[PDB]
Amino acid sequence: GAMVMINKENLSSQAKLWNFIYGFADSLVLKSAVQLDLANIIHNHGSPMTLSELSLHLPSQPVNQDALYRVLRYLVHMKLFTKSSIDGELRYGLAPPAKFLVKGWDKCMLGAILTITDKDFMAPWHYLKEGILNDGSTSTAFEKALGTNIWDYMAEHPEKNQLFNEGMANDTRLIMSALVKECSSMFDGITTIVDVGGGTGTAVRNIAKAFPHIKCTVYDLPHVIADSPGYTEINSIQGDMFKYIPNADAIMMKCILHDWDDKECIEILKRCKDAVPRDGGKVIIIDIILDVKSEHPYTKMRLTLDLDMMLNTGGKERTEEEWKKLIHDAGYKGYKITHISAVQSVIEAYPY
Template identity: 60%
Template structure:
């Protein structure tokens, strides 16, 4: 009997894997229909007919909508209650992450990762184990950067997804958990700073800092002009502007070891001997950890393998990189995020 129960439990788990793709695409559908936004705007649970009236597609197949909502209630995205005998749907805690405008919403990130072109490379995962090149390159015939350049319509949602992940979630954790990190320095350059939203939040929290984002010319051209943040266009592989602190936030995990060492060496040249440091915000991988976020970190390592050819690194791997680049000292700070903070001291 015990063996039979184990087999049944294993059967349930493997079926979850088999249909895991469906759950995220159901959530994508809910975002496209604006279901969470409709309920949030109403401020109270809605009946199916009330929800149907506000969904921006017509005519709505009522039976299909009911079955979709029924499944998302089971997913704990929405709630269901029947105070007067009629089903009413409200927002569960998970559903709040699908509300546009909330500072912790995951809408852009979900839409980006479920884009067809970003899902196709996973079908070529097996091929990426043979020879050189990522699964993305083997699926689409170009790197992810080349794809963005060729399809500018994908660049905006991709940048919004990155801002969703790094600014609304990671940066808030960085500011709250590492206030001492920015004391003792007067200037900070965010290398690969993208739209500058992360640096804007840091500059507002630490007004003594002279904050600058540094990125490729086309990225800087498209970035908002925040008054708190200076913008410099350039190439991190050729030059990095001088500052007391250099911030590398989710940059090095995109790259191979040789490129990481090259960038870290340039960072070392750009900070002063007295008090200068490089702040790396990236995952410190421990596959044996029982931390609930370990699976997410390992999954992100596969993301790097599929899309960029980079990797998530263990502390031993980070130490090896830093030593090779001329950083004899470092310390790791764990924050309320998937990533950690590595303070690297070049002298």
């Protein structure tokens, strides 16, 4: 026979399923709160605001106040926003994690939120079954959903190119302080550095400002360098890192190697090794290290990014043992990991 239930089933376990089913509601309610700029209206106001007060400052008019109330009720329940009775009125304030929704500091996450929750950029996730049950197709889910591989897609869609680049610029802003303060000695002795796949230059503009002695270069594909500002003192070069890595004292790669399969990473890493001097040259990798055995605050999002790479780029997020095999296979002498209390860690890879 089958299981026969004879008493009340657990509500909490059913609610766990419902909450996972509706996970996307947290994503897309958060998207709307960002688009409405609620956190910044309140933060600029400097104290909790009534529904009416909030409405007057919203990005467009008119405002459906019943809808706004109901979205605020949901955001209160997420514990991003607060609601309380003050002097005879209901007033909406910010909870502590809403600080990341507030503009004007390095940990504001708004760019990354608008990129990741974009409708077209979410589409590949609908093709996850197809990533396992391939039917012999070797295309990424991104190509199944949007027509071609991610990099050529950005080349062909300027508005999406800009959205993607600004999400990565934001992710870079989140780490740059910890990188230039905690890892300052990594930049000792260096006179030149190339950020390979450096995006629209957030990382190099920050390194250049912190280390005015170092001649910095950003290097990426033409359509990304075309979405970047021009500065006289930083070199901007375009090209294909699979064919050319510029000789420099140090090469850096942030959120690059997680886009590629093992063979491709080894090829990239070998070319980076050949580009730096035997005397003090180093390759600085910034990417996730997946823990195998313990849970950390960013564990859940690092596993999420593992699937994101699987679907969107064809890459993966790697454990330390996997990083070790790759760096070994590329012919380096060894590596050193530095944690910077971020999603990614720093891995210095040292040639002979």
